[PDB]
Design a protein around this ligand. Structure first.
Ligand SMILES: *[C@@H]1O[C@H](CO)[C@@H](O[C@@H]2O[C@H](CO)[C@@H](O[C@@H]3O[C@H](CO)[C@@H](O)[C@H](O)[C@@H]3O)[C@H](O)[C@H]2NC(C)=O)[C@H](O)[C@H]1NC(C)=O
Ligand SMILES: *[C@@H]1O[C@H](CO)[C@@H](O[C@@H]2O[C@H](CO)[C@@H](O[C@@H]3O[C@H](CO)[C@@H](O)[C@H](O)[C@@H]3O)[C@H](O)[C@H]2NC(C)=O)[C@H](O)[C@H]1NC(C)=O
Lengths: 262, 49, 52, 49, 52
């Protein structure tokens, strides 16, 4: 069947603080948190999509994440989501993770890097659940009524939902310029890098292989990997490549459904 | 009115037309960042609840 | 109901069948980026990224 | 309850962009001049200001 | 309170806890919890890592 998560990639966005009070571009940036389920279940949204390995195969243990225009994968274990206490992870698919957290004033998600280094993001969120009914109990009893309530299910059938997707912008880089002696070289690897230089009418246009300048210094030429060929996400932390926009559509998992609470 | 009951009003649950009034405003981005800042009065439905 | 340039083909049977993405990824994505307002989008997206 | 939709910003390297009006509920659009954004590997839009 | 602890030679935890009422308050006129992605810059003081 359709494997829609083949034209999508993890990306790198700007997280407010990475668990230490300092801000840096993390691969596990947190987008909006949705909590319209009565029993108190959250739909946290990553940036680094999970459940699908680097080779675009469904795996229960590998999750993709972006690392400098290069995709790797990390073990699904060590995916820790927490609030004032320590949450419980229910669902896992795509960008979205389901959790039931104790009350608190923030939440963070983190996972080990390829070299086993924690990559965390922390967002301010006032979580305080109130169970359906007229009593503010904590855990379910072994004798009681049944009251209707709503929750997020684990089904991934047709849902009638949308995410806007677009092609990634011209990612800039500077580690690909190497000044040897009065000339620079551009690294390759599949990245059809775009360039713009000021030295002697310069050079406008995109290459696909190595190139030499022979004329000017480093601080005139530039690297702008274009990539394309994969939809990223429509996030406010990463720019667009064109004014009239392109836009796509993907269905989010875990719809909302009726159950009964005790 | 923004911030109270019926800030956004839809003539029917299936109606396409929508009237929203929540004092959405945009602010200049900080230097060296790409974030599109904005400010908005919170939902009127939640405060009515 | 979907259109490509001047094709106007049914969305259920795109002209790229089969392996639309594998043959030409970028062409497939730019194809899907003009049908977002067409009601027959999802069935096109079903066919576009599906082949054995 | 409402839901604020914020599409990704459009940064024009070495140029100026013009705002266009649309018929959307509570639409807001503005253009900011003199930005010098940054990304993870380096700051694109070579033009200084 | 707070406690500090670290393993012995034989991997036995050695601990010590002291009574201490900790309740920080950020500088300014809002008691926010973690820093935002858009705000003001207010001076403060902190302990530096340098050992000069
Ligand atoms: C590669 O980078 C150079 C900058 O080093 C870009 O040149 C810049 O081009 C823009 C418009 O194409 C210029 O903006 C306007 O130019 C007119 C020209 O008369 C001027 O009157 C305006 O006041 C405004 O500056 C900009 O000046 C120019 N910068 C220069 C020459 O240093 C070039 O566009 C880049 N390549 C591509 C393909 O965009
Ligand atoms: C949980 O159960 C409730 C009720 O058991 C579901 O609400 C029901 O949703 C259907 C939508 O298919 C409503 O039908 C609608 O009827 C109106 C006419 O009044 C029509 O214009 C619509 O096109 C649609 O056919 C139904 O009225 C509504 N029930 C009530 C009492 O309002 C709910 O969808 C279930 N699922 C959840 C909450 O996730």
């Amino acid at each position: 069947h359709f494997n829609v998560y083949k034209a999508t990639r993890p990306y790198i966005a700007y997280c407010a603080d990475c668990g230490a009070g300092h801000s840096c571009h993390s691969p596990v940036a947190i987008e909006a948190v949705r909590s319209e389920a009565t029993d108190g279940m959250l739909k946290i949204q990553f940036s680094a999509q999970i459940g699908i390995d680097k080779s675009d195969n469904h795996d229960y243990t590998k999750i993709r994440y972006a690392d400098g225009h290069a995709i790797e994968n990390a073990v699904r274990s060590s995916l820790k989501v927490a609030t004032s206490g320590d949450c419980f992870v229910h669902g896992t698919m795509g960008h979205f993770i389901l959790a039931k957290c104790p009350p608190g004033e923030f939440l963070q998600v983190s996972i080990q890097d390829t070299r086993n280094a924690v990559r965390a993001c922390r967002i301010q969120y006032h979580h305080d659940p109130q169970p359906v009914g007229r009593e503010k109990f904590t855990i379910r009893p072994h004798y009681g009524k049944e009251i209707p309530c709503t929750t997020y299910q684990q089904t991934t059938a047709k849902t009638v939902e949308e995410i806007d997707m677009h092609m990634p912008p011209d990612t800039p880089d500077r580690t690909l310029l190497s000044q040897q002696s009065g000339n620079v070289k551009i690294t390759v690897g599949g990245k059809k890098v775009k360039y713009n230089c000021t030295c002697g009418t310069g050079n406008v246009g995109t290459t696909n292989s190595d190139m030499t300048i022979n004329t000017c210094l480093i601080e005139q030429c530039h690297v702008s990997v274009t990539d394309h060929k994969k939809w990223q996400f429509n996030s406010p932390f990463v720019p667009r490549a064109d004014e009239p926009a392109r836009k796509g559509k993907v269905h989010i998992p875990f719809p909302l459904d009726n159950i009964t609470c005790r | 009115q923004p911030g109270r009951f019926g800030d956004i009003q839809s003539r029917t649950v299936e109606s396409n037309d929508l009237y929203a009034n929540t004092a959405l405003k945009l602010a200049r981005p900080s230097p060296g960042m790409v974030h599109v800042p904005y400010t908005q009065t919170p939902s009127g439905f939640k405060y009515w609840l | 109901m979907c259109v490509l340039a001047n094709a106007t083909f049914p969305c259920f049977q795109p002209p790229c069948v089969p392996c639309c993405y594998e043959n030409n990824a970028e062409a497939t994505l730019r194809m899907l980026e003009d049908n977002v307002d067409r009601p027959g989008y999802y069935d096109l997206l079903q066919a576009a990224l599906t082949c054995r | 309850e409402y839901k604020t939709v914020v599409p990704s910003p459009y940064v024009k390297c070495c140029g100026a962009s013009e705002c266009s009006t649309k018929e959307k509920p509570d639409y807001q659009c503005k253009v900011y001049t003199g930005v010098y954004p940054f990304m993870w590997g380096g700051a694109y839009c070579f033009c200084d200001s």
